[PDB]
């Protein structure tokens, strides 16, 4: 078995190897990369996502989210308070303000210490989930707005034609902006490209050990657990590396820098934080190996997790028994 300790693997494809996206994913899996839940891909030196970032300041963040925490430093939830619209230029200036900027630090490890010590005492503002793309249309390799669609994968594997579309999302981050512990909708893959700015630190649990994280989360968030049988789908709960180590949960960590891709694999729980002003682009995707994960994925039916138009069809075809109750949650 390849990668039996489930370590995060880092790949350096040549420009020749960067042509065929599906084939490279399948290569990484042949080496065991999926066992970690997360992999890093460093693009060939010749590749670029676009020529410059010089003209992005007029993108609008229609609903910036203030991430307010409750709990203790290592075990907390966050809620998202909606703020007034602002441009990317306005948000960058805010991120660089004395109130919101990255503090002085020695290295990534000192910054990680300061994040876990201090996160809960501040409420950073995240421009998340903005439909759009920063890839130039002429970038032919690993262009996240030109991938094969999940609907077309389901049709190729299973023969069934379904409605829905699959488009990318932009994330504008600042110091302390946080992504809670989650897997993807329908336990899909995700791919994330850090276009510019400061790094993003990731934590991940191997897919084969995901249920260990779920059991800890039910113990640590006991009212949330009674409210919903899949409450990590609400994307609100944080648990620190120190707390995971104290409870024997297997995990790994890695820092993504500008110009690098990350891939999350089906049922790979992940969480993390931004080091400073940055912009990432991400999208879900599928392969043949995903289909069985999609059939087994948990679902939120309490009504909190409220998800896309395109997830309807996935539930309806892969989980027809759940269909009914899950759509009661979504209406
Ligand atoms: O970058 C973020 O805030 C969150 N991204 C992801 O969870 C991902 O790409 O799967
Ligand atoms: Mg602009
Ligand atoms: Ni994710
Ligand atoms: Zn729920």
Swiss-Prot record:
Q: Which residues of the full protein are shown?
A: 11 to 341 of 523
Residues that bind Zn(2+): 228, 234, 300, 302
- UniProt catalytic activity: N(6),N(6),N(6)-trimethyl-L-lysyl(9)-[histone H3] + 2 2-oxoglutarate + 2 O2 = N(6)-methyl-L-lysyl(9)-[histone H3] + 2 formaldehyde + 2 succinate + 2 CO2
GO biological process, any: chromatin remodeling
Its source organism is Homo sapiens (Human)
In this chain, Fe cation is annotated as bound at 182, 184, 270
Any idea what this protein is called? Lysine-specific demethylase 4D
Q: Does the keyword section mention Cell wall biogenesis/degradation?
A: no
Recorded E.C. number(s)? 1.14.11.66
Location relative to the cell: Nucleus
The cofactors required by this protein are:
Fe(2+)
* Annotated JmjC domain residues: 136-302
**Record keywords, A-Z:** ADP-ribosylation, Chromatin regulator, Dioxygenase, Iron, Metal-binding, Nucleus, Oxidoreductase, Transcription, Transcription regulation, Ubl conjugation, Zinc
Q: What does this protein do?
A: Histone demethylase that specifically demethylates 'Lys-9' of histone H3, thereby playing a central role in histone code. Does not demethylate histone H3 'Lys-4', H3 'Lys-27', H3 'Lys-36' nor H4 'Lys-20'. Demethylates both di- and trimethylated H3 'Lys-9' residue, while it has no activity on monomethylated residues. Demethylation of Lys residue generates formaldehyde and succinate.
Q: Which gene encodes it?
A: KDM4D
- MF terms in GO: chromatin DNA binding; damaged DNA binding; histone demethylase activity; histone H3K9 demethylase activity; histone H3K9me2/H3K9me3 demethylase activity; metal ion binding
- Which residues take part in binding 2-oxoglutarate? 126, 192, 200, 235
> Could you give the cofactor binding note from the entry?
Binds 1 Fe(2+) ion per subunit.
Please tell me which top-level EC class this enzyme sits in: oxidoreductase
A single cellular component GO annotation: nucleus
Superkingdom as given in the UniProt entry = Eukaryota
